[PDB]
Design a protein around this nucleic acid. Structure first.
Ligand SMILES: [Mg+2]
Ligand SMILES: [Mg+2]
Ligand SMILES: [Mg+2]
Length: 62
RNA sequence: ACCUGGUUGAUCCUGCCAGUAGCAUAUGCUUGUCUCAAAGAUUAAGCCAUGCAUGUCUAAGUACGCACGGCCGGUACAGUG
């Protein structure tokens, strides 16, 4: 009758693309699953994982 | 005549005795000050309570534990862990 949510989204870029059916022209950074987090006595915040296997200028320079 | 003394009618042979200094094992009485070193052994390589004796991170493999935290709408990832 009830439901238990899945708690973690994908982290590798290709797995994000597979989950959200993205193309090559789509920006992976736009579709990162952000997690809201709010403890009593602390201001609300939102955290996202670090994308892995993401092409950046540093990799191209290497 | 290869130490000093003993075992004979004389000369000898063979068995012997006592004194003299150390090593090892065990054990006594005494022990004010100071420096250095040692520590096994029942043919038992026999039996063991308890604790300890081996762990490790740099700018540089992997952090979405608010576990703690600055800046924010630019918001993939500040940083510590
Ligand atoms: Mg990488
Ligand atoms: Mg004689
Ligand atoms: Mg290193």
């Amino acid at each position: 009758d009830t439901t238990v949510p899945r708690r973690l989204g994908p982290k590798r870029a290709s797995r994000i693309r597979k989950l959200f059916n993205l193309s090559k022209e789509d920006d992976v950074r736009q579709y990162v699953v952000r997690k809201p987090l709010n403890k009593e006595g602390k201001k609300p915040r939102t955290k996202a994982p670090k994308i892995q296997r993401l092409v950046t200028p540093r990799v191209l320079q290497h």
